[PDB]
Structure formats: structure tokens, C-alpha cells
Design a protein around this nucleic acid. Sequence first.
DNA 1: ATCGAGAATCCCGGTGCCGAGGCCGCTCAATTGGTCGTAGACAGCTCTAGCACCGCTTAAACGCACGTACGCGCTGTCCCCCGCGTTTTAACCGCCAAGGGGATTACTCCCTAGTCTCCAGGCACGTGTCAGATATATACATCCGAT
DNA 2: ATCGGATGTATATATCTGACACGTGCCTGGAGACTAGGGAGTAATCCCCTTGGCGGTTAAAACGCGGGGGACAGCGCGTACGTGCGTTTAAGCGGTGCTAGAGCTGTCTACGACCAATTGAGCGGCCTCGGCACCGGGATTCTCGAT
Lengths: 99, 99, 82, 83, 85, 108, 109, 148, 76, 94, 93
Amino acid sequence: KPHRYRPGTVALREIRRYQKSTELLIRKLPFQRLVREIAQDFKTDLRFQSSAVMALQEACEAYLVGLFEDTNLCAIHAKRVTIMPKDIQLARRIRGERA
Amino acid sequence: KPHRYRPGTVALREIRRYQKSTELLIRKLPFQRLVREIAQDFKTDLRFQSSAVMALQEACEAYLVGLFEDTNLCAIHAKRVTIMPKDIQLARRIRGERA
Amino acid sequence: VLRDNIQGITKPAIRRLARRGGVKRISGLIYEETRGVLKVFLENVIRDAVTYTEHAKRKTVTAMDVVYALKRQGRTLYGFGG
Amino acid sequence: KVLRDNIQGITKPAIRRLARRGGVKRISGLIYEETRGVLKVFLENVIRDAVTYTEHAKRKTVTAMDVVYALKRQGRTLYGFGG
Amino acid sequence: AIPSLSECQCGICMEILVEPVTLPCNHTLCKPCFQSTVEKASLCCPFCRRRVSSWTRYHTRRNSLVNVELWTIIQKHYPRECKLR
Amino acid sequence: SAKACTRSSRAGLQFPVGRVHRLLRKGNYSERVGAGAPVYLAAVLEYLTAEILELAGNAARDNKKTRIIPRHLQLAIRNDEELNKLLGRVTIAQGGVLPNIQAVLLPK
Amino acid sequence: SAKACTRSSRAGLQFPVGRVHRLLRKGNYSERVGAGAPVYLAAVLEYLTAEILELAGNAARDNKKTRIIPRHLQLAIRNDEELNKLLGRVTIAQGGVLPNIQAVLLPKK
Amino acid sequence: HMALKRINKELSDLARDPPAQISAGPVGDDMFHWQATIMGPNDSPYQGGVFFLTIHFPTDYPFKPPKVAFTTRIYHPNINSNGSICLDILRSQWSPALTISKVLLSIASLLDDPNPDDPKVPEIARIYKTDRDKYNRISREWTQKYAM
Amino acid sequence: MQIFVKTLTGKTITLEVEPSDTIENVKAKIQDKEGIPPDQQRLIFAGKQLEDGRTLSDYNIQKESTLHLVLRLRGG
Amino acid sequence: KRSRKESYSIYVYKVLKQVHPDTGISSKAMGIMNSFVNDIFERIAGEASRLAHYNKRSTITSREIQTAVRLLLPGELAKHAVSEGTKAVTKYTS
Amino acid sequence: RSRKESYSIYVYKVLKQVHPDTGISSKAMGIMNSFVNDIFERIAGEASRLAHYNKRSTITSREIQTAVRLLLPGELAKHAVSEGTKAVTKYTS
DNA sequence: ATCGAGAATCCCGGTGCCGAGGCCGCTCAATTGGTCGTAGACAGCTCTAGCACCGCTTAAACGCACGTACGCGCTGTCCCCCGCGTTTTAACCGCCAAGGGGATTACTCCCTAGTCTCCAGGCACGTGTCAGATATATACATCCGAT
DNA sequence: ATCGGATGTATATATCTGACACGTGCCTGGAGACTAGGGAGTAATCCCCTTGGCGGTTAAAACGCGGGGGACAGCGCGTACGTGCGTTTAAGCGGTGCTAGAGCTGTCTACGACCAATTGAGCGGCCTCGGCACCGGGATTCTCGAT
Ligand SMILES: [Zn+2]
Ligand SMILES: [Zn+2]
């Protein structure tokens, strides 16, 4: 009696929705805290301009989007629809990031 | 009565032998003719220094060897032993050459 | 001092990134690898950014330093300066 | 004195030798045409820039320096020929 | 598709077109004027005054400029102008 | 052309010839800068900017908006083959990605 | 130092310093060039060259030869970790490739 | 070549429909050289003034803009002392479809009211725009001293 | 007294000037006699430019003095 | 008051008005245009400098800029840009 | 004729200093020349960029040090900076 | 093959806000005008190396026949992400408050480019010699059918 | 589970040649001394904005459960590719001959750098009104269980 969508028919709706929007997808404070942690690991007592954090978020999001696109391509090439970590390392190695 | 090797042993022997060696693996004259044809397509009546042809051959051989390594890695990822044209296409697509 | 902030990149965030990338189904072990690669990339960028900041005898990492490090790495960015 | 269809000069055993150096064990039958196409595309890309360099300098003979500079511009630095 | 002789002529040359091309601004005139304008003029339609370089790039690489339907009509209607030109 | 007027109007361009000339001269590119270089450079820059902006405006009009936003720039750059080839390694801030979904993943 | 010997000898290097200074000045890198930069640059160049030469010589000796051919240089560059990262996009003429075979292709038991 | 034929259609069209208050003709046998005469518009301080213009046509017409020069001296904000003319049509808005009659009537319109956006000479520019009477009677005395 | 002004082309024009005369009136007279605009002329005397508010006696122009005429043309 | 900072705002706005007579541009897209113009100018100037140093010359003549454009740009954009530059310089000299 | 310069003799000196036995062939010498030139161009370009970034019109040693830190990987960069600092300290007195 | 109930998405109209385009005042750099040391365009000469040809090999390419092993498709099993409802949590907006440090200006001083003069470090060239490639003859590691 | 060919690979020894190491003449670029002025270091001051915090409120995250579709393993097959052998093909090596064109040299003419005045283009600051954000209502269209 209750109405439930079949598995996988709402994921495509999410794909269609998210490829239409442009806003960021990672919450601001967690990313800012992570950036501050890494920076203070490198050199202590640093201050960040807000524009720098925004630029870092844009770059990280674009890089991850590209990586996931290539991972999905590899997973499809392996006659599957699910992305697995081995796809991620294969794509990264072919791109030359780790060799 | 005749002694013939199992399919897949002398191929490994060739793999071991060629990787140790370093000589050029393409005949000089056909490659020179191909280079002259491609060049005369652009501008007419060119003359080629021998060093230019040698450098072009070295670059082409290195590029093809790298592409074949990546193709083999993709083929092994797809749970196969044979390399196929779709594997070359996928490797080029990941590398960003085809775009 | 701060510790264990990599968990701030929550599972729904990686899910949304995959959904934008064009992914229908995600395995359960993707998230750890994604966090690892994100940490590696961030470390690589911040090293150059902090080096640029420290060279100029400053103390604040302006957006110009970050965009300059990104340009050096081969990932040129438009919008925040340059 | 023009030349024609010389891409067949890259023989099947030559591509097999290159693949063996790459580290492959079994080769499909359709690899050779794809390899020939890829090689032709790459050669065209390099030769265009080399010819541009040799044409700018008001010369008529491509040299090692032109090809080396073209490769360096394309992103594949080459040692062993000067520069 | 104009039977009239006068309207057919090039807006600049004042004679019958030779191998015409149709602009995205729905303006028709002979190709040599387009070649001359792209080499020397402002790379825009003299009347519309809006740039068409993007359209020209798209159509040029596949030689989409040639228009067969407007080609056939001009000689089938007015052969002697084409022959003298 | 007739002398004794502004340089940018002699060539019929809108980009500043003088500023480009100063940038070339003091930009640590070469010891001397020719008099014909800045005009050529300004013309090339103007042509490229006009080419980008025409497609951006077309996309904005197709998207019912009358003001160009970075999403329109992303659409215009990525949809054109030549410009995408030129700007291969460049990321536009807040532009999203092109709508593209693989054929295999589509429902049967 | 004593300011009596040659600049390379004064700084205790083998690479030239005056030649590096001339290259920096005439290379169109800056309007002005400091008096300490060429020494630093020559030192860095000498250190990198020394490391690569040491590795190449070790590889050649392990192969039982008295001359460094390009193959030994290629082996030294590839086997080392940091040098391989530094020269990842460099092609060495007549350098061959490192020997490796994927574990899957090996014969079964 | 084609420029000759184009200029021939130009002469035919200007002869069949002569412009009002402006008339041009061939100064010499050479087809490119032209002499034109313009009469001062009624709604202007240029009453009683007749002005002669010389016209040079480049080889590529109308594919390149033509050149015009003032034989006489006229006090206008957009005109140099030696006879240069500053119009965006002649160097910036030239189009092959544009013809020779409307450039002359545009010059007449400029003589009716000048354009102060791009002053050829700042002195006459603020003579014009600071006060009307200044420009009015100085242009008057100019048109009696030279045109008449 | 009377002075001479030599133009850029070498042409020499005679001028009737006085130490107490105003610059604008003299420039207007030059415009009437020659056609050159009044203030577009640049007058050079012993390497010093002439100001509109200044007088002839201020710059010490004597009888039979030669001035240099400079044309300032902008636009085109 | 803050110090002056030069930018290509006015010229890009003028070109936009020339192309589309009734469309404005946001601030972020304006900055993106400015950055893109700077990037392309840096690319062309650097390529021209290296190419002129390769031939033991000293001046960046318009020939060097033309060859740098023909190298950097793709097939069709290079041809159109060369045509535009040659037309502009020919108009400028005469 | 004309003279062409190279880093051949200095590379040979370094080789003799490190390995006093092994000789080096011609092609290896050309490869070392190309490597030295490539590294020099990279470091000089980075130093010039850093100098222009802060509105500086000169290239001091610290620009070279920062360029070395930026370019080379970790251990190599640290050792190179140590060597350069030692050379500058010894040269200045 | 479809009808129908339920849920997500698009169209349209009204209300409100802030930033984008235009205007005003002003400081600085682009333009003009002239002079001057030199970059390279051009003509002429030289001789290196690239192009074309020929002859004789002999290694490499080719086509064919046979066997076999693996790419591919079918079937089944199971288990693990997905979709949805409920509960816990901190992101985010708005606000206030301080002071660290980026940004600016003025002063001084000393580092380096330019110039001239002199001299030896490195390059083109020529020469002697041994490191290694080549050929020939054994010793041994490894593969394959079949016990 | 090895056994015995049988193949290919690795090892030891003579050899002879061409590439590598070294000496030589010298000349052009590197070094030493002196000068001048602008670029950079440093001290003092402003106020921008970055860190820190507090209250709420609500969108987003964490959690759990039913299950259905997808990952993975096993099995059969027949077709494509490896392996080997005899045959045809053109790469490779040597030697010769011709000359187009790279490379160098000497003149001098015109293009570009420096210098001063000067003023208009462009930049900083303000302001206002319309395009876009947003909300509420309705119309449209995918979607799935049941036929
Ligand atoms: Zn026509
Ligand atoms: Zn039109």
C-alpha cells in the first residue's frame, strides 16, 4: 500500500538536479577547520583570508568531481555500474598522479 | 615428435628480452618516408636533418610504449589478458589526449 | 591544536559530489579512499601556498597565494584574482 | 616525387615488438589499425609545430632544435639532442 | 526564391551573385564580398552590425557555407549572367 | 592612418594599445619591443574576448536571463569545441559541469 | 674568504660562477641580479649533477662496465624515488624502460 | 575594376536623385577625385556660406573608407584647422553598404549641431558648451570672414 | 613697437604689440590676420612659454624681437 | 583612499556592448573575463619571448606575436586571430 | 668558425670527484648537458616569477632558495637548500 | 501490449531588495616632439651536409596450417546498498568587540650596473690507445610429455 | 611425482678497432678598480578585517529496517590468436657524385630608447532603480503496481 520508488530511479533524479545547480556541496565550517588543521601542521600561527578558503573549496570540489567522473568511466568499462576503490586507484594511476 | 612450446611462454621470453635491450624497434626507412609525407602535407620542399628524424622516431617510440603500458593495465583491470581497441580508447580518454 | 577533522567531509557530501559527477551507485568503501585523496590534494596545495606566504614575510594566506599555487600545479583557476 | 599511403610502413611485427616492450602478453587483431591512427595523429601534432618553428626562422631545413622545442612545448621534454 | 532580377543582385556589387552564402542574419550576397570583408572590414554584417564570427567558424571547417538550393535557382533562372561572369 | 590622435582609434580597436605596450616593455619579456607588437596583441585579445562574450550572451538569452553569470561562461566555453580545447586545464569558479549522463546507466 | 682566487674556487665549487652570472644577466629574467644568486644556483646544479652521476656510476658498476651509457643513467633515474618524481615527464634517448611484468601474466602452477 | 563600376552606379544614383543643398561631381578626368559643394543650413549660424570638399577614393571601394578634405576653413568643433574631419563613420563606422550621400548629409547635420563627446579641439569645445552666444557670433564672424 | 613671429614653416609675420597689451586680444588679432586659432598657438621666446594672464613687459620682449610659433594639433 | 589598481573592465564592457547592445555582465563574470585576458596575454607574451630568444634576436616584432598566436591557438581560432591582427596592424600603419 | 659553450668539463670534474674510475661516453655527456640546462631554466624562471610577484626588480639569493623549495621534492629540496646556504656562507667571507 | 493514483517538476503572477550602471572629481601616465647609438636587412662568399643513385647481401616480413585456451554468454546464489521514516546535532545567520597586522609614507644608505683595461680558461683540432663488441666453444637453467 | 631430452641462456677466451682521454695554440670572455644613483631596508602610523563569542532555528546528518537488484562464481563453447616453417621482400651497408642552402662577413640606414611638458583617460567614491530572489498558487508530466 505505501508508495516507494524502485531502487535506483531516484538516484538519476539526484544526478539531474545536482548537475543543474552551481552552489558548493561541502559544508563551510568543516572544510575551513580541515584547512586550518593542515596549515597549522605545516606552519603554526597562520591566518586565512575568506577568499583563500573559498578558492580552496572550489579547487577541491572541481578536482573531486573530475576524479569521480573518471572513476565512473572506468567502472562502466569493467562491465559494472558500481564504483569501487580499485577503479579510483586505476584512474589515478593512469592520470599520472601516483604512477 | 616435433617440439613446440606452449602458447604463452615465448611471448614472456620476448617480454624479458626486449625490456633489457634498448635499440629502436621500428625500421628507419619506412618511418623516414612517413615523416617526409606528413611534413610535405604542410609545406612543400622541406629538407630533414638526420638528427631531426632520429629525435622524432625516439619520441614516437617512447609515446607508443607508454600508451601500451597503460592499455595493458586497463585490460588487466577488466579481468582479461588480451588488449583491445576499447582499452586504448579508454586510456586515451583518461589521459585527456582525445578530450 | 586540532585533530580528527577529516570526518567533517561527511558521507552525504561525497554522495552529492558523486551525484554531480554522474554516478548512479556507490560502493561502501569509496568514502575512505575519497577522504585520503582529498587530504593528499589539500596537503599538496597548502604546502605551496604556505611557502608563497612565508617568502613575502607575511602572516596571512591571501587568496592570491592559493590561486598562484594552483596555477603552478597546473590547475589554473579564474575568479578570485590573478 | 610525392609520397602516398606510407603508414603501412609501420609493420605488424613492429607494433608487436613495441607492445612486447610495453609488457603485454596477448594482442587482439584490431590493435594495429588503432595504433597506426594514434601514431599518425601524434606525428601530425609534432610536425606541425616543428614546421612552424622552421618557417618562422626563414629557413628551409628542419633541425633537431626545432623538433626538440616542439616536443618541449607539447609537454614531453627530450634529452640527448642538445638544448 | 525570388523570380525578380533586381532583388536578386548583390547589395554591394549591383550584379548577379556568384556562389552565394546565406548569413545567420538572413542576408544574402556574393562570397567575394565576404572574403574581402573578413580580411579588411569589421567582420560584421553592414546592416545588422552584430558579429557573426562564431557562426563563420562553425560553418567554415566543414565547408557548410555553400548553399545548393540558392545555387541551382540562380543559373536555372538567369543563365547568361552566370555565363558572362 | 593619419597621426596625431589616440592610438586605440587609429587601429579601430577598443582595447588599450598604450597599456599593452607598457606591459610588454616593462614585463621582462625582451630588451626591446617593436612598435607593431602591441597593436597585434591588442587585436588578438579583443577578438578572443568578443568570441567568448557572444556565446556567453547567447547562453544567457537562452536561459531567460539578461545578465551574464559564470554559469553561462562555463556553458559557452565547454559547449564550443575549439574554446574547450584552448581552455583545457582551466576551472571556472562556480560554473558547475555540463549536463551529461552515461547511456548505460539510463533505465531500460 | 681571501678574495684573491677565482670565484668558483673562492666559493669552493666546481661549476662556473661567472658563466652562471652572465646567463642570469643576459637571460632576460630580471632587470637586476644580486651578487649571491649565481653562487646558490651553481651549488644546487652541482649537487643534483653529483647525485645523478653517483647513482649512474653505481648502476654501471653493478653491470660490470667502466662507462656510463644512457641506459645506466635511465636506470639510476627510474629506480630512485625523488629523482623519478622530478623527471617524470622526461624522455631519455636510448634509455629503454625498467623491467617489470604484471603478476597476473606469470605462468600458473 | 569593381571600384570603377561601383562609383559609376554612385554617380548615376546621385544624378538621378540629387541631394538637397549638397551637390558633388568629378573634379577631374581621374575617376577617384571628386569635388563637392555644400550650402550652410538654414538652422545654423552658417548662413550665406558655401563650402567645397575634395574627395579621394582608395582602390578598394567601398571596402575601405574614402578620404575627404576641407578646401576652405570652417569653424567647427570637430574640424581641424588644416581641414581634417572627425566622424566615427569615416574611420570607425565605415561599412561597404553605406553610401556617399548620407556621409555628406551627416556632415551637414554635424554642422547643424556638433558632437562634444569626442572634441577634436578642446578650446572650441568649451567655447561651444560654456555659452551659446560665444560660439554663435564667433562662427558668424568666421563665416563672413572666410565663406563670404 | 613691432615684433616678428616665425612659424614652423619659416614664414615670418609682423605684429604690432605693446607691453601693456593683453594676450587674448593679440591672439584674436593673429587669428583675424592669419586664421590660426588664438590659444592653439604656442609662443616661444628665449625658451619660455607665454601665459595668457601675463604681459609682454613681464617676459621682457624688446623691439625687433623674434618669437617662435608652435602649432598644437590633436585628433585625427 | 586606496591605491589605484588597473584592470580591463571598461574595454571588456565596451566589447560586450558592441556584441550585445542590451545585456549586462555580473561582477564575478567580469572578474573571470579580466583573469582570462591576463592569462592569454601572459601566454602569448611568454611564447613570443622564448621564440625571439631562440633566434638570437632582441626585439619582439609583430612577426613573433603572429607566430606565437599561430602556435598557441587551435586550428580555426589561430587563423581568425592572425587575420584580425594583420588587418589591425595594416590599418594602423596607414 | 664559432665557439659553442657547454657544461661538459665541469660534469667530468664532478664525475672524477665522485667515481675516480668510471668514464662517461659522449651521449651521456649530452644528456647531462640537457639536464643541467633544463634545471637552470626551471629555477631561473621560478625565481624571476617570485621576484615579479612582490614588485621586486632584483633576484637575491632568497628568491633562488624559495624557488628550490617550490620545485624539488622534499629530501632533495632540503639537501639542495643546505648546500646552497653552505656555499653562500663560505663565499661571502 | 495499457488505465489510474500519487508524487515531482514547470508556469505564472505578485512583492521586495541590493548591486550594477551611470555620474562627478581628480591625480598620473600616455602622447608629442626631438635627438642619438645601434640592430639587423641585404649583398656576397664559402663549403657542409643533404639528396639522389647503384649494387649486393641477408635479416626481417609474409602467408599458411594446426591446435588450444580464453572471451563471452548463460545460470544461479546471496548479500549489501537504497529508499524511507525517525531522532539527534551543529551550520548558519545576525550580532557585537577587540587588536594584529597589512598597507602606506618618509628617510637614508649602500649594492650594483656601467665603463675601461688586462689576461688566462676553455674551445677547435690533432693524436695515441684500450673497452668493449664479436666470434667460438662449453656449462647450466628451464620447459614439456609421462610417468 | 620426477624422469630425460631439448632448447635457450649464461659463461670463459682471443681480437681488433674506433671512440674516449689528453696535449696544444690562442683568443674572447671573465676578472679587477672606480664611480653614481636609485632600490630596498627600516621607523612610525592608520584602520581593515580577522579571530572570538553568543543565541536561536532549522536544514542536514546519523540511525535503523525491509528487500530487491547487482556483484561474483562456476560451467560450456568455438572461435580467434599463438607457434612454427618455407618463401618472398626490401632495409642496410658501402661507395659515389652534385649543389641547395646553412653559416659567416662587411655596410649603413631606419627603427626604437630617453628625455620634458602636458593634459585627458581612467580610477575612486556615491547614488538610485530595475532585474532577480522568493513565495504562493495551479498546470504538467514521469512513475509504478495491477490489469
Ligand atoms: Zn558582392
Ligand atoms: Zn545582416
